[PDB]
Amino acid sequence: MVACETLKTKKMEVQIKKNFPSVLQYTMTDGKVMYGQSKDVRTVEINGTNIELGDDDVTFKKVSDTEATYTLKVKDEAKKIDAVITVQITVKANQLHLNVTKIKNNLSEGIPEGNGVEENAIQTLSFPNQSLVSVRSSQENAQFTGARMSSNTQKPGDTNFAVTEDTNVTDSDYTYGFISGAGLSAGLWSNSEHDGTYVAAPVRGGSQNTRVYATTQQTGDATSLGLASAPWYYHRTVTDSKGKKYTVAETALPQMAVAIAGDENEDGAVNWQDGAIAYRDIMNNPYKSEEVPELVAWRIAMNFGSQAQNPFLTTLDNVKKVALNTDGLGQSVLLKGYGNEGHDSGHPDYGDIGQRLGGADDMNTMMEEGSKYGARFGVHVNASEMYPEAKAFSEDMVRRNSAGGLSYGWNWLDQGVGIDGIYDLASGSRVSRFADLSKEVGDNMDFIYLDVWGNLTSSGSEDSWETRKMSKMINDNGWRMTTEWGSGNEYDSTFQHWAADLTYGGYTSKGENSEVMRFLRNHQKDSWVGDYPQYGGAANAPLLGGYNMKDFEGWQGRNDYAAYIKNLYTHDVSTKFIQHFKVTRWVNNPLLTADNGNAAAVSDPNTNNGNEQITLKDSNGNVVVVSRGSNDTSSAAYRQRTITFNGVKVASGVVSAGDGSATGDESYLLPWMWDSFTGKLVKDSEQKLYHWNTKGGTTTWTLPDSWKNLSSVKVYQLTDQGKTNEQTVAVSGGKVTLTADAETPYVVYKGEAKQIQVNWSEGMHVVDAGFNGGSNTLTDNWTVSGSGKAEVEGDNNAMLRLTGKVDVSQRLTDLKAGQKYALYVGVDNRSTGDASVTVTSGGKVLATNSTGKSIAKNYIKAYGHNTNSNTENGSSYFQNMYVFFTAPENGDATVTLSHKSTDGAHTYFDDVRIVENQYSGITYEKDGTLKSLTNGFENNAQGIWPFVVSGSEGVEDNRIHLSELHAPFTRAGWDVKKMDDVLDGTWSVKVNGLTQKGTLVYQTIPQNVKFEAGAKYKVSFDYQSGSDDIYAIAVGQGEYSAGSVKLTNLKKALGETGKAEFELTGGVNGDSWFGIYSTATAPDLQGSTGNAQDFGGYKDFVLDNLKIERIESQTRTKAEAQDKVKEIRGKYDSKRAELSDAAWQQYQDTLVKARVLINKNGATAEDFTKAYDILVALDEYMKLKDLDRKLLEAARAGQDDEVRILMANGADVNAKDEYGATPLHLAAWTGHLEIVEVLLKTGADVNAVDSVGYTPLHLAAAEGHLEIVEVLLKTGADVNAQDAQGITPLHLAAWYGHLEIVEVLLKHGADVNAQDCFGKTPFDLAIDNGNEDIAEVLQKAAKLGS
Amino acid sequence: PKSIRIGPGQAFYAX
Ligand SMILES: [Mn+2]
Ligand SMILES: [Mn+2]
Ligand SMILES: [Mn+2]
Ligand SMILES: [Mn+2]
């Protein structure tokens, strides 16, 4: 009978066809009608083939008055298609859902086990020109609005156009699509993982997901524009990098919907904004997006290269600090390096929680305890790059290129290899690794941060489909999705690092630039464009703000706590406040023009003088209206923004430019009316307002309706200690007057506010381990004793500062009796008197350790107290001091941090960490002196102990870490690998590519290994070095200064472990140490190309099984020692003139020290032996320092054979004079090619610089020795080496007039455009000295730069 | 101005 049926709700009646799942029309309660597919279109697409259905191919069943079921017989024998598709059409309110509930393939039994290939798989499905909802040219105000992806601030992702007779579109794809006309508006939602047309995206991470297809057709006189879903993936067949094919099941069954809207925002018009309001009821919502508005304080807490810079319980104290300063506002901490050894270590072993940070135990304590303060935690994971050390590393996981070789990644600590994305998904390997992490964290962790997804490292695909499957794995474990790139994961991501950290990428690589996407989802994502004016467009004071992310916990060296907090109040409190409301109207957008495809864009001259305005509303009917001052970019008023909450002004002014260029004048009094948990409204006594005034001053405000009848308010200034300086401010006629300091946070309450209670250092075995508890932490938690002074000093990261004779002690809690512990503390000692750490059980000393004056600066970029943090006087010598003890059976255990000296100098202590440690390799003498120290690096609490990282790279994410065993991948011989990562056990100390640095890589320090003045020690270790003489052993005293060290070159030991052993005599000051020096010798890459040069291990150095043993020395008499003083004296007293002031003062120091030992009352043979061994060591040092002085003279004078014998006898090839000139500098400058070449073949630094920044090449080129210049360039000299003044060898060649030297320099890579610090090029320097000949040649060379 | 002749520790701009 009738070929149509009627589905009905209280909001509309929909007429549907019985012969195909098609809507004829939607009729609202008010009579208004929207069309569907008015033509006989019965097309189904399977695998790219279109099949038109007959009357016999479709069966209909009206289930209810709100449901109908169809069965579509889709067949094409020729194209290998035979299927039964079950489509269900359901209605609810003003929504119509069309879902494919069942797919039956008659040409298949299904996907074979292990995701094998399904022959004749239904891979794709769509209904071409289904026209679920349509508008005609013949209808009043018939228009279309679409959105595509744009990460470019200058290019909007939107389209707004009128549907006219001329309109002709065919499957025009959009992320979102809305059609309006004849008083109604609707938008189509589909779950299609189709990738298509985008405006601007620098990556593929589901950035191109286009789910709506607009197509026009003729409906009589009119052109109808109809919306359909983009194709769906069912059983997609994919190929891995090794050519292996897989069939992977659906992420979800095909689903789509439409929501018909009238005048939803009740303005004049019916446009896409009405359709967008109704679309929110049918649209997909990212998992856990309902918590985004609460996440005020986003940051990164970083750990890298075995250093445990941020253990999990430390991160909880920083959560407690931020909570105090923000008065409990929600937080979101991304843990960058939560696993393995830290950041870019152990990928993709997601279930491996960093043992050195406190393992899964402390991570869960941090997470459980942190939730009480509104903090959410999440981990940084990588699904694209893998390291041989990761237990997931396999030949199947390895991404291979078309040639069958590795698809290498970045080499830093170890060499990264690309993961096979398709294998990792199809094998179900990734789900298994996420599950491992899920087993560790349970329901405690909040989010996952997926790094690099979209940059085509795992596949050349990484499409929306793959991203959807990825987001599902993560969501399935109860985790919110966050990713790297701004355009990435349109569907499921709630945060993009390159959208939230505005610093990164530049104006083309930011967040989602769309009025449509932000209107819909602003309150669900931190994936937008915020204020960063130097990008222009969307980044010039967006009205809705935008997350501006700063950090203070090591991420990229970032550690300014005050800057972090000031930024939260400047941009993020207002951004988050706005995310508590949903956009309802958005008119007069200055970015939308007729020239960028937005001719029909929403313009109201009766709203905000015709300038931009956004109206947002919430479920309780609260209205926020954010209005722009002027729409003219050249106006001062373009950056003026007023915010009203229920008609009352709450924020006003210009924000400080997000690029930190220019401060503003913005002042606000924002009503924060939500809890930091579910975001539920809080009770009246819990209701508060946040005050901020950028410029400082006095401002008058109207309080919200709720507060109008109060006679007074209570105002508190917020600090690192919480609510301070309580003020009682009167209320007159519902208005308050607040005096604010510039850029200072205040919180306003209706009455007296109870202070948030913070118990510092929970589970840390001590209370206030980080000294964050103010000046009163020394009264309440730590107990100070002594004549001296103990202060909590530090305006950023607080520290304990000791001056004079003082002891700071505290009782240790919750230690397991009989169990082995390691207690370490950061120490920077500027006093000459000892700084100590002691553990005691009822007066008895369990363990003790001490440092004299600190000798090594801190070079750990991700550590709070590195030498760029200015602990005192522009440096930081912070290094950890350890005590190893066994927890007492009685329970009584106490820690004391002492300074013994009466010396006015300061000692700095921070981060007392008591951790379970099974290390037991230190043996002491009868006196508390070192007898023996052994370490296989198997129980290192943290770092490369007893060693510390030196400054070969400066303040950096150092390429030194504890390397982990994973045979066969970490052993020599796998692929192009030639060195073993681990020598003995599971751990070693790896150095990656730190060659030709000419300086110290790492060294022991006296607070780690103390060498007694005059004592003999035998030092031995197992090692592997990629080349001959690239690394060397250094032996020195006190702070490192070049030339003061005794260097022993280490021979090549590649693939087969070598053994190094030597003797050491403790220096008189007890400041003796040994380490690993990077020479100036170039590595032998042995024919290796590209990545094989880095992976081969030709430039690496692995050390293991260290053994420091005090040894017996041949016994001397007072006479033998006294006789040696005469020998030394009548050898070097005659050189007073020939030596420096400091060189002679240390010679006297040592001699006096040795003479104290000999002449001491009651001295014994140990004293006479020590005095003799000190003098023997002094002799060997003086002798080699005179061999360096004599080599610098023979390079200057010209003696060939003399330079050779001095060198043969051990004179330093890189010795420096008073001006920092090496023998190679002095030979190149006085013109001796013979000396230069032999010096180069020996291992002289061809790029060594003097005080002024001259390389030997600069001195050679300035003097005109062209044969020397040619040798230097061939032996590896930088042709573009710059002076302190910016002078290059080309400038000096040009000014001094050496035509031939100029031509050879520019024959090699010399830049002719290169300018000094005074803008002069080599050409300008030639036209000043009269070398017009040189100037003409130089002019000609620059000309060719076209 | 611009140094007479440069060498070890002798900057190009000394006056
Ligand atoms: Mn409207
Ligand atoms: Mn601290
Ligand atoms: Mn070992
Ligand atoms: Mn490693």
Author numbering:
A (entry chain B): 339 to 1684
B (entry chain D): 1 to 15
Give the exact sentences the study uses for this entry.
Here, we show how peptide and protein targets can be reproducibly crystallised as “guests” in a host crystal under predefined conditions, and we explain the advantages and current limitations of the host lattice-display method. In order to apply this approach to biological macromolecules, we engineered a host lattice comprising auxiliary- and target-binding domains; Fig. 1B outlines the design strategy. The auxiliary domain defines the robust host lattice by providing the majority of crystal contacts, and thus also the crystallisation conditions. It serves as a scaffold for rigidly positioning the target-binding domain to immobilise guest molecules at well-defined positions.
To test if a single disulfide bridge stabilises the DARPin and allows target binding, we introduced mutations Lys1655 → Cys and Ser342* → Cys (*refers to a symmetry-related molecule) between the DARPin C-cap and the N-terminus of a symmetry-related EngBF domain. Using these mutations, DARPins B6 and G10 were fused to EngBF using the L1 construct. These DARPins bind a cyclic peptide of 15 amino acids cyclised by a D-Pro-L-Pro unit (c-pep1). Complexes EngBF-L1-DARPin_B6:c-pep1 and EngBF-L1-DARPin_G10:c-pep1 co-crystallised under identical conditions as the native EngBF and diffracted to 2.7 Å and 2.0 Å resolution, respectively. The Cys1655-Cys342* disulfide bridge confers sufficient rigidity to identify the DARPin domain. The EngBF-L1-DARPin_B6 difference map was sufficiently clear to build residues 6 to 14 from peptide c-pep1 independently of prior structural knowledge, and the structure turned out to be virtually identical to the previously determined structure of DARPin_B6:c-pep1. After refinement, the c-pep1 main chain and most side chains were defined in the final ED map.
